Structure formats: C-alpha cells, structure tokens
C-alpha cells in the first residue's frame, strides 16, 4: 500500500496473508476471509507452481515479524481458479481457497460481507484498501498491515488510462487524479471494502495497475458483485 498508515487490531478482521514456506517464509499475496472455511483472493497469486502444501494462510495478524512457529495458520484443502482465467490476460482474476479446517469467528478474525450481484457501488464515495504490499513502486513488503482511503472512479474514466479493452464490466478502479495512494505488489488478492449505513461490503479484489500510485493511473480490482453467481456456486454445501 502506497501512502497508507498502520492499521489496528480488529480493524480489518477479514484480511489474511498468504505465505509460502521456502528457506525463509515469505508473504506473497493478501486474501479476504468470506466464511469459516473460505478465503477469496486473486487467481494470479498462483501463477507459479500448483503445489498446495507450500502455502500457509494467516488470519488475525497485524505484524509479519510477530509470526513465529507457535502462531496458528490455516492450510489449503482446495484452490478453485476461475475457469476463464489465463496467465497471459488480466481478466477473471479471482480464486477461492477452501481451508483444511473451518475457522471460528472472533473479534480479531471475522468474514467480510459479500455484495449482491446487481446492487450498486454508486452509494460509496471512498473505499479502503489494505495489505502488506510495497509502500512504493520497486519498494519492499511492509511489516505492519497498511490501510489507505481511495475514491472509486467510473470504468469509462479508468479505461482512458489503460489499453483498449483492458478494463471490463467485471472490474472496478480506484485512484486519485494526482496519485500518491494505491495498492502495489504484495497487496494482490486482498480487499477493497466500502462502508455505507454502518455496513462493510467487499467491493473489489486487488488485481493490477501500471506501476503504483502514479497520477491519472487508478488501481484495477476484480469487481466482486460481478462474480457472485460463481462464488455462491463454488462455495455451496456438498
């Protein structure tokens, strides 16, 4: 997160960190807890190897350096990448992770509510984007969970700043005319949430942008309302 500040315990109880245990354990992507056994993230976080056991999912955490061998984590039981996602294109950048064990909901670890398929984002002005990603372009993973407040822009406005056809109706963008505040590498898969009438909704999944926090260059997110049929079909009881 570029131009953000430090979050507090319980502020973003749905935020998780997707880490891979290599020689050192490394945060690679964010995600959002959407139910006891389900995390929603970006499909491109899995562009490497398909191995599930390398991943550790941490929830109810604020600071990456606080994690030690005794810190609890979740494991992956299943990864479900959208059938239309291709590594070579930006579209359909969404994936579900089913955890091996259901997590209980506590003040520190709780789901973000999902929207409805047709309901509107026009009731929102500014939304919040969070993560441990870079704090500048070519920066480094941040230790303490960062938050930044950014206005949504229309898709017509967003498409002015990107190559034709790259911004679809299933994406939403957010940015400031003169930049300085945006998601960046390492925030991918995390939440863009908006609050209205005291209720938070998951509106976007951090996906991509041209650099980070440049002027006239809104960040691009997968629009969650446009995938609600897919999300409900894939997560339904067996």
Curated annotation (Swiss-Prot):
Cysteine disulfide partners in this protein: 29-45, 127-194, 158-173, 184-212
Top-level taxon: Eukaryota
Domain Peptidase S1, first and last residues per copy: 1-236
- Where are glycans found on this sequence? 6, 63, 104
The active site of this protein is located at: 44 (charge relay system), 93 (charge relay system), 188 (charge relay system)
- Provide the protein name: Plasma kallikrein light chain
What organism is recorded for this protein?
Homo sapiens
State the gene name recorded for this protein: KLKB1
Full-protein residues shown: 391 to 628 of 638
């Amino acid at each position: 997160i570029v131009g953000g500040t430090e979050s507090s315990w319980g502020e973003w109880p749905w935020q998780v960190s997707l880490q891979v245990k290599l020689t050192a354990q490394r945060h690679l992507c964010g995600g959002s807890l959407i139910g006891h056994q389900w995390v929603l993230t970006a499909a491109h976080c899995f562009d490497g190897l398909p191995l599930q056991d390398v991943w550790r999912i941490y929830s109810g955490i604020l600071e990456l350096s606080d994690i030690t061998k005794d810190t609890p984590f979740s494991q992956i039981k299943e990864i479900i990448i959208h059938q239309n996602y291709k590594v070579s294109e930006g579209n359909h950048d969404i994936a579900l992770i089913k955890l091996q064990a259901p997590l209980e909901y506590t003040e520190f670890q709780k789901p973000i509510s999902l929207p409805s398929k047709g309901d509107t984002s026009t009731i929102y002005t500014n939304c919040w984007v969070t993560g441990w990603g870079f704090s500048k372009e070519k920066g480094e993973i941040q230790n303490i969970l960062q938050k930044v407040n950014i206005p949504l822009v229309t898709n017509e406005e967003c498409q002015k700043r990107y190559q034709d056809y790259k911004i679809t109706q299933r994406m939403v963008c957010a940015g400031y005319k003169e930049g300085g505040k945006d998601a960046c590498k390492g925030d991918s898969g995390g939440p863009l949430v908006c609050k209205h009438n005291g209720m938070w909704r998951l509106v976007g999944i951090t996906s991509w942008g041209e650099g980070c926090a440049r002027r006239e260059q809104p960040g691009v997110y997968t629009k969650v309302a446009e995938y609600m049929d897919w999300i409900l079909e894939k997560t339904q009881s067996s």
